[PDB]
Design a protein around this ligand. Structure first.
Ligand SMILES: Nc1ncnc2c1ncn2[C@@H]1O[C@H](COS(=O)(=O)NC(=O)[C@@H](N)Cc2c[nH]c3ccccc23)[C@@H](O)[C@H]1O
Ligand SMILES: Nc1ncnc2c1ncn2[C@@H]1O[C@H](COS(=O)(=O)NC(=O)[C@@H](N)Cc2c[nH]c3ccccc23)[C@@H](O)[C@H]1O
Lengths: 346, 334
């Protein structure tokens, strides 16, 4: 039977369109085609200073967003990473099997260790979790032995490190494993920042006019898009390389039109966006983008509100058990191969 | 009743330093307080290893420990890999630490293509301790820095999360917290040491221990006395001997030498000292392996099973308290 999918999402009041288009939107297709596993990666969130109050609120808020979006706990498995000690344990086996060198060359680590304060002596103060989390990820993946791992472009190096560790583990412990395959959305694998389209939309961006947050009110969405940096070539078409700004708004618009809401918008526009905007201004593009966007956000924020606390709890409670069903099986097999545990001596 | 907690890594290289440093006092500790002792295999996989040798070593260590007096009815003896709580508690300590702090560690700084675990384990050790809110952590002198890091993390989390914490207290045997290497008395006895003649292993046969001690380096003053700075060699052999005379097996010898070793060896030679140490060490090393076989593969497993349940009890209570403090888990919603 059925092919398996695993993916994790970090919670944050900064959840944005890059996240939605990157993985969330395709979640509804996945739970129909695969045995889908999805979790709130709160063990990745605490790798930097954080407020326990904020963490709790966010973990709750993410589950509601995923539900408001269509993730069905009857068709898929949605859990909270920290609810399973199996994650910390598997993450640990991965960590002891990695070396500092490979972890230090990670691009995300470089660009992140550079995102923080220096001690009085001038040296950088880097929480250890920033260096090691990519091993936790490898473990989160391998615990469910999935066929694919749907993620955004930015997560490619991590998938590679994970396959290297899987092969490393397989070679040394002769453990029967399945190499997880990296899978990204052909079109929306990397939504760009609206202010500086040469950078991806990030929760970490200082300037917020470049990020469309999932909890941004319509008036804010309107202003941000109206100010989206374009270019002075006045030509609406897909040209990532030469017109990052316009191209970005264009591929976002295309992805939003597939949504039920926006049915009228996509009908009014036709399937050939370039042909439609052929005789129109950049302002006409921002206008259409602002409508598809507002429509989507208002419909997420709408449904997201209907989801209740109890609902979140029961959901996570069932996911916990379900996910833990396959996590224990896998960890147990690794224990055998590693020689860990006491049920290894008669 | 106060609580104690300690970990020991399994290894065919188990030596006298490990025995006098921590093992020999377990008999007393399980009587004086709530003792938790575990085989630190999570720490053993921080460097390349063989899974078969690992299960074999973990098993052997439980035997040695049982054979030396650890009573499962008076203390809790378990394998840390059996508790997922360790990996989680250690993950929390880890994310609360920083690289400089860990790069400073003498072991790492003086041991650095490096296995990631070689850098992070002091944060795991910190977690192994904190998981049981012990009053004391009985270890050898060499673990001092680790306990200092544990206290630092403890206070850091206590201030950051308002968590009700009890800082662990580093405790070492005052006379045997640092057994020195027989070849080079300025260096402590270690498993890693490449000149194996300076290290008496718990499994070293009679003729081997005889040969190692007879060759123990001394000095040229011809004075048997406690004088570590000027005479590391004889002083180390002296503190080893005195410690061994406390064991039941060396009763006859104890009566012979008396309670004042400096007085006994007053009119003797270094050869005599070596001869006494040899008799005391052999009597110990052969007694231990004797009892070691009186321990079946079954007794070990059952001991670990009970230790697991007992240990998991307080470990789970401690972890839950950390969870509600870090805002982790599903129960923190509702
Ligand atoms: N601008 C962007 N465009 C498209 N996709 C984007 C994007 N910015 C972020 N994303 C994706 O949005 C998703 C969630 O963002 S995220 O929380 O930062 N993702 C992460 O931090 C992951 N490392 C979490 C994780 C931990 N273990 C895992 C195992 C499998 C998959 C993911 C994880 C990821 O798939 C990102 O790649
Ligand atoms: N030469 C020596 N003289 C006296 N004591 C010595 C010694 N050489 C080693 N020891 C002690 O022997 C005991 C076991 O040695 S050891 O396995 O190498 N110690 C370790 O590996 C520790 N990291 C084990 C550990 C993990 N988590 C812990 C939590 C609390 C206490 C210890 C641990 C420790 O207390 C050492 O300090």
């Amino acid at each position: 039977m059925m092919k398996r999918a695993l993916t994790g999402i970090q919670a944050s009041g900064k959840q944005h369109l890059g996240n939605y288009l990157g993985v969330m939107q395709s979640l509804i297709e996945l739970q129909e085609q695969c045995q889908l596993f999805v979790f709130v990666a709160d063990l990745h969130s605490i790798t930097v200073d954080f407020q326990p109050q904020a963490l709790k609120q966010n973990n709750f808020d993410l589950v509601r967003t995923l539900l408001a979006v269509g993730l069905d706990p009857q068709k898929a498995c949605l859990f909270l990473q920290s609810d399973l000690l199996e994650h910390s344990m598997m993450g640990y086996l991965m960590m002891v099997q990695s070396n500092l060198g490979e972890l230090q060359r990670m691009t995300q680590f470089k660009a992140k260790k550079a995102e923080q304060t220096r001690n009085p002596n001038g040296t950088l103060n880097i929480p250890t979790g920033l260096l090691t989390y990519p091993a936790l990820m490898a473990g989160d993946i391998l615990l469910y032995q999935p066929d694919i791992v749907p993620v955004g472009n930015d997560q490619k190096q991590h998938l590679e490190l994970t396959r290297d560790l899987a092969q490393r583990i397989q070679k040394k412990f002769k453990l029967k494993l399945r190499l997880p395959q990296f899978v990204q959305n052909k079109d929306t694998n990397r939504i760009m920042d609206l202010f500086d389209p040469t950078k991806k939309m990030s929760k970490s961006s200082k300037n917020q006019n470049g990020v469309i947050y999932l909890d941004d009110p319509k008036e804010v969405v309107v202003k941000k898009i109206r100010q989206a940096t374009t270019d002075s070539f006045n030509k609406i078409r897909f040209a990532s390389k030469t017109q990052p700004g316009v191209t970005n708004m264009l591929t976002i618009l295309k992805a939003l039109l597939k949504e039920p809401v926006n049915q009228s918008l996509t009908n009014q526009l036709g399937n050939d966006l370039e042909a439609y905007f052929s005789t129109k201004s950049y302002l006409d593009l921002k206008n259409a983008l602002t409508e598809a966007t507002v429509n989507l956000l208002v419909n997420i924020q709408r449904k997201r509100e209907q989801i209740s606390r109890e609902q979140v709890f029961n959901c996570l409670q069932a996911g916990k058990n379900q996910a833990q069903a396959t996590a224990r099986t896998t960890l147990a097999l690794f224990y055998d191969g590693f020689g860990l545990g006491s049920q290894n001596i008669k």
